[PDB]
Amino acid sequence: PQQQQEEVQRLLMMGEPAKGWQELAGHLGYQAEAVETMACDQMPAYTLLRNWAAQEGNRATLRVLEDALAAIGREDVVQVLSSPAESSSVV
């Protein structure tokens, strides 16, 4: 849950992008007035847990996270998060 923002943000946030966190707002039911602040509101991906949830999370997570990101096509980070690098031995 938390590591899902602390790690995911380490792919798009770097540079304050207009995609990803923003594209989520489309499925998250947000607004430009807030999308404008989200980019600078204690990190969009970090605040997302409290912003998207509005209390803590769970309701808009676990299964909603993938939908909210897949319905728009934002596996750019999900892919990275679920595929860092191969090495060592065994799974």
Q: Where are the domains of the chain?
A: 1-91
Could you give the CA distance from residue 54 to residue 1 in angstroms, rounded to a whole number? Answer: 15
What amino acid is encoded at 12 in this protein?
L
- 78 CB contacts (<8 Å, ≥6 apart)? 8, 66, 69, 70
Concatenated DSSP letters for 7-70?
Answer: TTHHHHTTT--SSTHHHHHHHHT--HHHHHHHTTSS-HHHHHHHHTTSSSSSTTSTTHHHHHHH
CATH superfamily, region 1-91: Death Domain, Fas (1.10.533.10)
What amino acid is encoded at 80 in this protein?
V
Q: How many residues does the chain have?
A: 91
Structure tokens at 38: 């989200």
